[PDB]
Amino acid sequence: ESADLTELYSIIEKTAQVVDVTASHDKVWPILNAFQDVIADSVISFRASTGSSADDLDCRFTMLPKGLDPYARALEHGLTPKTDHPVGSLLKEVHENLPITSCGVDFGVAGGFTKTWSFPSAEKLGKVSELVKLPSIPDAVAANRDFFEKWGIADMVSTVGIDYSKRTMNLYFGGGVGDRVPAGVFEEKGVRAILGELGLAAPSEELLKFCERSFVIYVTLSWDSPKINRFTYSVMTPEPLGLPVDLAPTFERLIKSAPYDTEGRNYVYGIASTPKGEYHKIASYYQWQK
Numbered sequence: 246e247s248a249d250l251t252e253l254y255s256i257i258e259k260t261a262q263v264v265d266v267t268a269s270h271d272k273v274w275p276i277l278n279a280f281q282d283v284i285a286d287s288v289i290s291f292r293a294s295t296g297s298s299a300d301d302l303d304c305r306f307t308m309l310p311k312g313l314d315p316y317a318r319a320l321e322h323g324l325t326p327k328t329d330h331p332v333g334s335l336l337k338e339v340h341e342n343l344p345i346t347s348c349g350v351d352f353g354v355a356g357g358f359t360k361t362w363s364f365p366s367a368e369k370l371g372k373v374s375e376l377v378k379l380p381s382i383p384d385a386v387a388a389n390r391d392f393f394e395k396w397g398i399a400d401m402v403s404t405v406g407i408d409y410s411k412r413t414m415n416l417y418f419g420g421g422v423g424d425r426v427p428a429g430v431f432e433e434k435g436v437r438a439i440l441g442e443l444g445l446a447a448p449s450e451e452l453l454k455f456c457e458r459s460f461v462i463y464v465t466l467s468w469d470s471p472k473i474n475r476f477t478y479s480v481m482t483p484e485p486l487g488l489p490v491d492l493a494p495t496f497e498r499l500i501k502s503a504p505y506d507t508e509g510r511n512y513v514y515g516i517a518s519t520p521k522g523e524y525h526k527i528a529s530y531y532q533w534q535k
């Protein structure tokens with residue numbers, strides 16, 4: 246299992262360099278040791294971003310087993326500090342009260358431990374009605390409950406992400422064989438309506454074309470704002486070079502020159518909309534479980 250960590254660190258360091266980031270051994274090695282017992286059966290992917298997030302590469306371990314509290318593991322190994330902020334208690338509340346069946350963690354290769362993900366199974370999704378009852382939920386979830394209901398997505402929460410570094414939370418909708426995000430969310434009229442009501446940048450032509458292939462969305466919320474922070478459309482494809490977008494040079498390099506084989510595998514691509522603009526994300530899959 247320690248040969249696996251040496252191998253993985255090498256891949257982490259090399260993949261970082263491909264997107265102009267340098268990995269921190271001092272930050273990354275403790276995380277590998279902390280999660281050594283769940284890494285072999287995990288799904289490992291690397292996510293690059295444009296915009297401000299371009300200064301780090303995210304490494305994600307997902308499909309982690311029930312029984313691991315990934316935040317508790319990070320705390321125990323000194324990867325992240327104890328906090329009294331509600332962000333620190335939300336994962337346990339989510340895991341008890343949504344039908345969570347697996348989980349994940351995210352770290353910046355430079356920045357260190359940053360996020361957890363909590364995943365229901367596709368056939369039994371989470372609900373905003375469950376989330377609003379949790380003591381540690383952002384107030385902004387209930388205050389925006391009608392956004393989720395009007396777009397028909399309230400009862401199809403497919404992942405809960407928690408960012409401990411920025412004190413934000415992502416709610417994901419759609420994906421896999423589960424209940425589907427309504428078509429209207431992805432049509433031009435809906436894209437314009439959603440971004441308009443949330444005060445986010447009007448959709449670009451390339452975003453509108455991208456949305457035609459999207460079946461997953463996610464909403465970012467915080468404890469310190471009553472407004473949804475951003476809204477992201479996601480697309481899954483084994484042919485990212487065929488997406489109706491212009492790809493950043495770093496993204497092209499990640500696709501063409503990652504130090505591992507993406508054996509006909511799916512990539513996951515996102516276009517986030519904020520009040521100021523659009524930012525892109527691409528995830529490349531190093532280790533996958535079939």
Ligand SMILES: [Cl-]
Pocket residue numbers: 426427428429
């Ligand atoms: Cl529909």
